[PDB]
Design a protein around this nucleic acid. Sequence first.
RNA 1: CUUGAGUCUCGUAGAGGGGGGUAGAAUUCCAGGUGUAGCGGUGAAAUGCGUAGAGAUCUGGAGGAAUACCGGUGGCGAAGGCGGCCCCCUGGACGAAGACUGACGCUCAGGUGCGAAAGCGUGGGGAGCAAACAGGAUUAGAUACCCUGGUAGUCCACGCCGUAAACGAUGUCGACUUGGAGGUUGUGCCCUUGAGGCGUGGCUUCCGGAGCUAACGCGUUAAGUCGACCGCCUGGGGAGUACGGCCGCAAGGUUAAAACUCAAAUGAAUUGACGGGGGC
Lengths: 65, 99, 117, 106, 88
Amino acid sequence: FCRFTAEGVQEIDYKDIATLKNYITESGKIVPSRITGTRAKYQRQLARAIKRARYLSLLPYTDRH
Amino acid sequence: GRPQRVAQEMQKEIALILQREIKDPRLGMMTTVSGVEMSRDLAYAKVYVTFLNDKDEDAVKAGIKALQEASGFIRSLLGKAMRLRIVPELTFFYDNSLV
Amino acid sequence: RKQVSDGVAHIHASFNNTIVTITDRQGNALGWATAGGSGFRGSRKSTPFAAQVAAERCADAVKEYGIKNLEVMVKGPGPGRESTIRALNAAGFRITNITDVTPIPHNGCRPPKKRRV
Amino acid sequence: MRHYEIVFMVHPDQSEQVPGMIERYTAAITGAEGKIHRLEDWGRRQLAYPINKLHKAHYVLMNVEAPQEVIDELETTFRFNDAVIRSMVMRTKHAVTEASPMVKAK
Amino acid sequence: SLSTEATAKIVSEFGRDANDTGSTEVQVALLTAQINHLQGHFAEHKKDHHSRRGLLRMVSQRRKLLDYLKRKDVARYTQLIERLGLRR
RNA sequence: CUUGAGUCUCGUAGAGGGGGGUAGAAUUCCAGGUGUAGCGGUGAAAUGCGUAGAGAUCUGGAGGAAUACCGGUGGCGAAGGCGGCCCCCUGGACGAAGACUGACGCUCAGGUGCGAAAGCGUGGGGAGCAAACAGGAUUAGAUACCCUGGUAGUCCACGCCGUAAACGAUGUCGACUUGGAGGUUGUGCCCUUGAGGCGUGGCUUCCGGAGCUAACGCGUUAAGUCGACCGCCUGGGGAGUACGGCCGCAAGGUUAAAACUCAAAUGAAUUGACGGGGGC
Ligand SMILES: [Mg+2]
Ligand SMILES: [Mg+2]
Ligand SMILES: [Mg+2]
């Protein structure tokens, strides 16, 4: 439902933890655009971005760690 | 085939799909299946599932229909999970596990 | 001997087997309950009722150190696991939280073939 | 030289050399046509997940149009050296000199 | 693959002018340079058959051009073949 | 001659490829700690396995293997196919815009490659898994299925091998002809403008008209209309066989008979019966 387009970012800087946290569950699983209604490329950009931030320790693989 | 024997194997498969593969969970809980009652030839499976939803038909009803509404989709799931030509008809029952 | 007062137990909510253990707050698990160990075997060890009754074996160790709080974990989706949690609430020990921590991998381990009719 | 955005952390405890090693690293940048288009440090920040049983790692960032080789020895250095505790190196389409979500909080 | 700058250097001499970009010569020269860049990749990466697939797509291409040129003016062909040091 | 063809410049997405890194779970092992009486197995046991203290828990390590969510008609590809993150190398696609070249084309026998898994070779490597084989649970054919183990294999590197229902069971290219709903990814315009309104490309999907089809259906991503080239078949069984060649180290593949035999083989649909089914 065109919310990333409202933000206006064709390329999403991955360092945006606040947006990433909304797209991340308490477990840390990525919510799909089925419910978030985000377009695929951003969906694509976010999934790769979450892993790299997770590698940098910005995002938790899972709280249990 | 032999229903009382295949029941143990099917219950494990039913639990795995129920817990990790849900996106319309009115239960929103770890609902646990007490038992299953497959017919001869496994044509019909009766799944008796208890609800971690405070054991009140109010919350339980939300899921049992949710259990029934997504059956064809979940049918595929269990239907492509034990190489079964019989995809069991799915039925759901809150169990009075507590009396 | 030494009081802990902050209960922390580990259960193994497997299908064919049902076993709880008592743990110290800093790991160091101390004492345990095996429903199979009660003499229940086969279907009887797996019965949800056996898991519910196994509370007394867990309770006696908890009573020896007199621990009260409840921070316990569930690993494995055992049949009627919620009923076992109800039995722990029926006991009336103060409950702080229960953790649904069935371990999920990334598919790294190779699974073994499923059994067939 | 080509664009990059680079971030790593040094063990928080070894922060004595953290201010100098940066430019001591940019010795490569400053000494091999390194056009550092931006650099950021954030300081000790609690790790979301512990790495090597460590917490509050010393966060730092770099933005350079750098040649193919310099980055290599630069990261092998990190691969070589041990004060650093984890590393990362990613190419960027263009140079980024805008407040980053870490600093933009300030 | 290439650098636009190398393509511009080839276009300036092989082409009559910078705009002259379709001339068979200006075409085969670019293909030959591309093959040389791919050959360096294959020296350590023999496994990368997938990239070899394109490699074929061009050696044959000029091969068609050569003929098309050769059947058009051997004059340029004759010099081209030796200009590009090919078919020696 | 320039629209076919192709180049340049501008981008643009993509599990494309090759290499090298690297992460986190998981599993096993090992370390400890605390902590035991079991444990796991079945329908039940057996089988396994525990006071050496197992089983459980944390803490640690080692190893190998694979990359959850995302993630799906979603892409990438000639196809087989491609699924953690990073970097190096590299193929192709596409849009826009303009120029350049000027028929530079298509198909392809022969040809040369490409190539799922298992398999062969050498040396590797060894989590987990699992043919073979092994212990307990047997007689309608138990020769068992089930559990307990388990080597090769499964991974690597280099080799061979060259087949799979390698399947859209639909050769390649080009042109022509009603719709609608999607997806995807371009990009123009016009709205501030998201959204919105006009577009306009690419690719993909589901209906579906006409048309075609034995029927089934197909249906602008035609099985409609056409064109060009290639490939193939001629009742069924014997039979993709004997044998000969070729290839392969083998395994083996490839090539491909004939003898004899028969009145059908066989496709789609249709109507019913039954049942070891279930709803009302
Ligand atoms: Mg293999
Ligand atoms: Mg075949
Ligand atoms: Mg296939």
